[PDB]
Amino acid sequence: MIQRTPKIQVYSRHPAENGKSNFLNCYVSGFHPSDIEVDLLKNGERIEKVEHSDLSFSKDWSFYLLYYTEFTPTEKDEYACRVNHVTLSQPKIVKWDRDM
């Protein structure tokens, strides 16, 4: 039927300062159907203890979810979000950028 691929944003809860604890967020939205795999990565490696919000959806019926984990950003560590969905043949990786 009508399958919609997820939009992805990776970002911090608060402005990022190196050495200061924070939350790393991966917001996935606009997708259908609802099954989705989201992991937060540190230098390509899956971070454990990631939580996510309860499945909900927007007025156009597409689904959205927030995945998040506590972390302390450093200069040498690269963070990213990895998302797989029926519409994607391989997971999509979106790097975290301080500016956007």
Partner: protein, 276 residues
């Protein structure tokens, strides 16, 4: 000022991958306050905002009873939809339901909602009169005929004009300090070169509640709606929201651009510019 309550149901068939699943969440404005998941270890309506915990055991009993009944109903509606659409029992399908009420600042009902979808497409919806249906296809026209015979609209209207508004008013008082106090955005503008001849100006709005906001760029006073990149408003994770808008500007023309913000927590609209 104005407020809404909404419930959102998702019922999913997943043959061979799991049991038919029913999940429901409830919101006041942009704040989720309850959840139910048929896949959870102990399925029950459960609190997701601290102010709902002042409801007592009888409340949670009745909410759980409602959710278990709807889970039973929508598991079977998935089977019925398969036959309406001549679809295979091997495929995965989804029903979604939404309903709720909108009230104005005086607390009076402004509109009620009840909509249904199958596989992400409108199926049937209660009209704004709260007494008639709009069916999207021939299958939903069967459903419409059944729901007319069962006077479903009358029961939706009774809820939407009564208990929906009464409970929303109650929650708004129980969680007043978070539900009725707007958190204004914190705003700033960043600059990042894209070459020796162009750069990005990005206007940020952070930590605001509720989620509705207008964030625009102007050039010499006129709005750059065509050349503005807006991200979807996104949750911070702490019940606030974030958004940014960016424009690509020629080198040395930064002073021509201004960012403009309007939000419930901002008593006057805001103008921002970038300076090095």
């Amino acid at each position: 000022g104005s407020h809404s309550m909404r419930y959102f149901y998702t019922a999913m068939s997943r043959p061979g991958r799991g049991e038919p699943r029913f999940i429901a969440v409830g919101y006041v404005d942009d704040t989720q306050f309850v959840r139910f998941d048929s896949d959870a270890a102990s399925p029950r309506m459960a609190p997701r905002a601290p102010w709902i915990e002042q409801e007592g055991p009888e409340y949670w009993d009745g909410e759980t009873r409602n959710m278990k009944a709807s889970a039973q109903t929508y598991r079977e509606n998935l089977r019925i939809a398969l036959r309406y659409y001549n679809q295979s029992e091997a495929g995965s399908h989804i029903i979604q339901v939404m309903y709720g009420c909108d009230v104005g600042p005086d607390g009076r009902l402004l509109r009620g909602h009840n909509q249904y979808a199958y596989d992400g497409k409108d199926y049937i919806a209660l009209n704004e009169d709260l007494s008639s249906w709009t069916a999207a296809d021939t299958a939903a026209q069967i459903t419409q005929r059944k729901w007319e015979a069962a006077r479903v609209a009358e029961q939706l209207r009774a809820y939407l004009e009564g208990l929906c508004v009464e409970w929303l008013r109650r929650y708004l008082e129980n969680g007043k300090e978070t539900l009725q106090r707007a958190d204004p955005p914190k705003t700033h503008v960043t600059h990042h070169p894209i070459s020796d001849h162009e750069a990005t100006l990005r206007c940020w709005a952070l930590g605001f509640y509720p989620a509705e906001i207008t964030l625009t760029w102007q050039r010499d006073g006129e709005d750059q709606t065509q050349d503005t990149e807006l991200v979807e408003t996104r949750p911070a994770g702490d019940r606030t929201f974030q958004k940014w808008a960016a424009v690509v500007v020629p080198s040395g023309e930064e002073q021509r651009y201004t960012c403009h913000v309007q939000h419930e927590g901002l008593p006057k609209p805001l103008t921002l510019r970038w300076e090095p």
